[PDB]
């Protein structure tokens, strides 16, 4: 048996692909042929299967609304079609026979070659890196707690601000702004918040903590396109 | 100012959707709406905005493909749509009001309330996790090494089987199955590749290491829906 798969694609965000799959050797409608997905930099996915004629499709919860198969019965060629494609389902996509109609035999032992499908979207190309430390402050109400933010790149902007911001995110609640543009205090934020940093350097410090103050806090950067948050930090109780 | 969205949407996925945001208390024209997506035990991400009026865009490489923004510059509401859902796009969403037209303040200052999307997957109960060990494993070439991977479930289908399969990844190459259902070895590979296991425990055993067996190793299974893989073992050499 032999799976030949189709060639690479160059793809534009938001097109839709349908990746074909060749099986020769063995009778095609008997068993079913798996897609199997990889990342760069990742595992092995399995996203779902097909078993051509015997209408009969299996997928992986996670690659619903994504991956659709059908099967040409007749050359006997196996498609997965990958819709609104986003920088994401950039990987490597495998078909390779599987499972067997009556359901004993169930290995994935022939595979094609795959079929490499690269979406254009400029993969995040030189986004502005913010490393917040600690990402776990515990403390204890009456603390005072510092958060640092630093940035890959200066953010100066040549108009003569530096666009970081600070956000506190408590679950149920939008993004509540603390300080922007480093150090000024957005209003309605008691005076225990404070912010002062230049360039990459960034500090967030909190006098004294209180209970309504305990969640996760971002810092953000809005010189550079495009706009980047910080990883995260819980500040949370000792 | 109030940025208002609208109410939680239970999706299919593949179902489409837009969700807007009602803007008051300003110049609807003279700050670029922004989106923000708050997944589930992930951090805050920015998924671009608009500018009412031009409609100018700009979107974060990662959402192109899957966000389109729109806005009613007769209404005064913002509007964004996601493509094809998948349940990566089950978060909570948000419109901030951002960038000014003249482009001196860029702050998220006032944020609607969040719109949370729950994209249906369904569930398959608890997917089999395989967790490998060692992840990493340095040796000389002709020393023996081991690998083993535990189940969270026992892999004994009732029809007696014991799908537990082992695959070799080699890059610019597709999975190289050795051993199946256990301790079968796959035609062709030699017998130097060993394996055996029982319940949960399941081990693969390479007597002799051969530089050809230099890779990452993944073992998977069939025996419980949805076929899951292991995370991944490193033979490298010393």
């Known amino acids: 048996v032999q799976l030949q798969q189709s060639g690479t694609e160059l793809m534009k965000p938001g097109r839709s692909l349908k990746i074909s799959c060749?099986?020769?050797?063995?009778?095609?409608?008997?068993?079913?042929?798996?897609?199997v997905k990889q990342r760069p930099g990742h595992g092995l996915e399995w996203?779902?299967?097909?078993?051509?004629?015997?209408?009969?499709?299996?997928?992986?919860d996670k690659f619903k609304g994504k991956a659709t198969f059908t099967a040409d019965t007749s050359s006997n060629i196996a498609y997965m079609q990958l819709s609104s494609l986003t920088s994401e389902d950039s990987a490597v996509?495998?078909?390779?026979?599987?499972?067997?109609?009556?359901?004993?035999?169930?290995?994935?032992?022939?595979?094609?070659?795959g079929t490499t499908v690269t979406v254009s979207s400029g993969g995040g190309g030189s986004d502005i890196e913010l490393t917040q430390s600690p990402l776990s402050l515990p403390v204890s109400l009456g603390d005072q707690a510092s958060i640092s933010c630093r940035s890959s790149?200066?953010?100066?902007?040549?108009?003569?601000?530096?666009?970081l911001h600070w956000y506190l995110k408590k679950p149920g609640q939008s993004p509540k702004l603390l300080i922007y543009?480093?150090?000024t205090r957005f209003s309605g934020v008691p005076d225990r918040f404070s912010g002062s940093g230049s360039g990459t350097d960034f500090t967030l410090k909190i006098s004294r903590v209180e209970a309504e103050d305990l969640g996760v806090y971002f810092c953000?950067?809005?010189?550079?396109?495009?706009?980047?948050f910080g990883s995260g930090t819980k500040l949370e109780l000792k | 100012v109030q940025l208002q969205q609208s109410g939680t949407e239970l999706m299919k996925p593949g179902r489409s959707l837009k969700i807007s945001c009602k803007t008051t208390?300003?110049?609807?024209?003279?700050?670029?709406i922004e989106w923000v997506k708050q997944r589930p035990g992930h951090g805050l991400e920015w998924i671009g905005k608009?500018?009412?009026?031009?409609?100018?865009?700009t979107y974060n490489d990662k959402f192109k493909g899957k966000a389109t923004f729109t806005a009613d510059t007769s209404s005064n509401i913002a509007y964004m749509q996601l493509s094809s859902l998948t349940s990566e796009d089950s978060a909570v969403y948000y419109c901030?009001?951002?960038?000014?037209?003249?482009?001196?303040?860029?702050?998220?200052?006032?944020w609607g309330q969040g719109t949370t999307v729950t994209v249906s997957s369904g569930g398959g109960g608890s997917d089999i996790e395989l967790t490998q060990s060692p992840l990493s494993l340095p040796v000389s070439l002709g020393d023996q090494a081991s690998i083993s991977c535990?189940?969270?479930?026992?892999?004994?289908?009732?029809?007696?089987?014991?799908?537990?399969?082992?695959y070799l990844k080699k890059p610019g190459q597709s999975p190289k199955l050795?051993?199946?259902?256990?301790?079968?070895?796959?035609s062709g590979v030699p017998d130097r590749f060993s394996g055996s296991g029982s319940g949960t425990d399941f081990t693969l055993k390479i007597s002799r290491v051969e530089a050809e067996d230099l890779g990452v190793?993944?073992?998977?299974?069939?025996?419980?829906?949805?076929?899951?893989?292991?995370?991944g073992t490193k033979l490298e050499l010393k």
């Open positions: 901030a009001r951002g960038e000014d037209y003249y482009a001196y303040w860029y702050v998220l200052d006032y």
């Open positions: 208390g300003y110049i609807f024209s003279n700050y670029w």
């Open positions: 608009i500018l009412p009026g031009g409609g100018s865009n």
């Open positions: 790149q200066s953010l100066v902007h040549s108009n003569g601000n530096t666009s």
């Open positions: 543009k480093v150090s």
């Open positions: 953000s950067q809005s010189t550079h396109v495009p706009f980047t």
